[PDB]
Amino acid sequence: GALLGADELARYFPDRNVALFVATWNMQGQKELPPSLDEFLLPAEADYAQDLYVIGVQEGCSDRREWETRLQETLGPHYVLLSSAAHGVLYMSLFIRRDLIWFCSEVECSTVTTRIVSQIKTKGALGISFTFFGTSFLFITSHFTSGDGKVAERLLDYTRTVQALVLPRNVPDTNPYRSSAADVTTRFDEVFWFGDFNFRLSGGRTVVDALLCVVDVPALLQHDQLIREMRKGSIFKGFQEPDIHFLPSYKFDIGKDTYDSTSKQRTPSYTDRVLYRSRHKGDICPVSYSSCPGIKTSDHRPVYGLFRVKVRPGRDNIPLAAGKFDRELYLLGIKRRISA
Ligand SMILES: [Cl-]
Ligand SMILES: [Cl-]
Ligand SMILES: [Cl-]
């Protein structure tokens, strides 16, 4: 049958569910990476093999290749880099099980800059999309406008991004009649948008400090701007977020578990989030959603979600990856594992 058809799908996914790991991390431009990425990429409850890893980074380390090399080395030879992209120091890397490269369309990327901050600094989005068998996926990572009082600007970051991301292009929309011209996130079966959205907890440092003294997370989240704005429909229309059971992932003193003890007294906040949307209700099942407290090189902790996503058979008359991946990186990862 077709490379991307029902027979192949049966061989590789009898239950038609794909295991996806999606993470976002703001690195604060740090030069030295954590000693081990094992706790980042293989979290404790990730007690089963992931099919796809998608890693979005904001304020990324200058040596993008070294970061990708360490990811490749940690995942090991069962995974290959299906795609990676950069828009300034905003990065995204997509690693997939090597036997699954055959079922992917060509991978397409797009970028949007939503705010010029200075001559050398901007905020924006990086989107990567491809079809897997017959099901299309769109991954967007973003760094939104910063500041407690800048919700209105964050709304504009959302709107500018869904209006401007030029995806898909060569690879056909899988359900075009369902698509809207004004929102790129309507053009795909499964959408994940993860980043430093910079939404904060309202109420001020003193009130949030009081709440953090067991922590009642639900009560804490009553102060979250992002849940508030999503609830009234002003942002991320059609998206959901998994339940949060972890503590705020920002702002931390470097290398420590204490929240910003400088005079600026930034209110601990859930700046880093993973959101999902699907064309078909129920296609995406969150399995776990958490931060990685052991990664402490940056003022932000990484945040990741594990998901199970439904996939459907496809056809071969689209532009195909057909075994295309970063072979040089793959070899570098092999080389590093021989060394260590
Ligand atoms: Cl960035
Ligand atoms: Cl573009
Ligand atoms: Cl900003």
- H-helix or E-strand containing 22? strand 17-26
SS3 state of residue 100: helix
User: In terms of Cα–Cα distance, which of 316, 337, 298, 287 is closest to 20?
Assistant: 287
Q: Which residues face 320 on adjacent strands?
A: 105
Range of the domain at 35: 1-340
For residues 46 and 27, what is the distance between their CA atoms, to the nearest angstrom?
23
| Span from the CA of 209 to the centroid of ligand 1 (angstroms) | 28
**What's the token pair of residue 281?**
């209700």
| Span from the CA of 54 to the centroid of ligand 3 (angstroms) | 25
| Span from the CA of 183 to the centroid of ligand 2 (angstroms) | 15
User: What is the rounded end-to-end Cα distance, in angstroms, of the chain?
Assistant: 43
DSSP conformation letters of 247-306: PP-B-B-TTSSSB--STT----B--EEEEEEESSTTSEEEEEEEE-TT--SSSS--EEEE
How many residues can be counted in the chain? 340
Surface-to-core class of residue 174, CB atoms within 10 Å of its CB (0-12 exposed, 13-18 middle, 19+ buried): buried
For residues 289 and 305, what is the distance between their CA atoms, to the nearest angstrom?
4
| Span from the CA of 153 to the centroid of ligand 3 (angstroms) | 9
**What's the token pair of residue 250?**
């920002």
For residues 140 and 125, what is the distance between their CA atoms, to the nearest angstrom?
7
Cβ-count burial 127-152 (b if 16+ within 10 Å, e if not) = bbbbbbbbbbbbbbbbbbbeeeebbe
| Span from the CA of 25 to the centroid of ligand 1 (angstroms) | 10
Contact 59, 317 (CB under 8 A): no
| Span from the CA of 293 to the centroid of ligand 1 (angstroms) | 21
Phi-psi group of 197: left, alpha or beta (phi > 0 → left; psi -120 to 50 → alpha; rest → beta): alpha
Question: Degrees (nearest 5) of the Cα angle 37, 125, 311?
Answer: 70
* Peptide bond before residue 168 is cis, with ω within 30 degrees of 0: yes
For residues 134 and 132, what is the distance between their CA atoms, to the nearest angstrom?
6
Phi, psi angle pair for 100, to nearest 5°: -100, -5
**What's the token pair of residue 233?**
């429909």
For residues 125 and 59, what is the distance between their CA atoms, to the nearest angstrom?
12
User: Which residue is it, tokens 């790129």?
Assistant: 184
| Span from the CA of 187 to the centroid of ligand 1 (angstroms) | 25
User: In terms of Cα–Cα distance, which of 253, 334, 323, 256 is closest to 96?
Assistant: 323
SS3 state of residue 239: coil
Task: Provide the total of helices (H) and of strands (E) in the chain, helices listed first.
Answer: 8, 11
| Span from the CA of 150 to the centroid of ligand 2 (angstroms) | 26
Ligand number with the minimum distance to the CA of 198: 3
| Span from the CA of 175 to the centroid of ligand 1 (angstroms) | 32
Q: The domain that contains 288 carries what CATH number? A: 3.60.10.10
Total Cβ atoms within 10 A of residue 116: 10
Torsion sign across C-alpha atoms 216, 218, 222, 228 = positive
* Dihedral over alpha carbons 157, 163, 167, 168 (to 10 degrees): 140
* Dihedral over alpha carbons 179, 169, 110, 13 (to 10 degrees): 80
Report the number of distinct structural domains present in the chain: 1
Surface-to-core class of residue 78, CB atoms within 10 Å of its CB (0-12 exposed, 13-18 middle, 19+ buried): exposed
Ligand number with the minimum distance to the CA of 148: 3
Phi-psi group of 221: left, alpha or beta (phi > 0 → left; psi -120 to 50 → alpha; rest → beta): alpha
C-alpha of 208 from chain center: 27
Ligand number with the minimum distance to the CA of 92: 1
Beta strands 17-26 and 90-97: pairing type? unpaired
**What's the token pair of residue 128?**
């990567």
| Span from the CA of 62 to the centroid of ligand 1 (angstroms) | 11
Resolution (A): 1.9
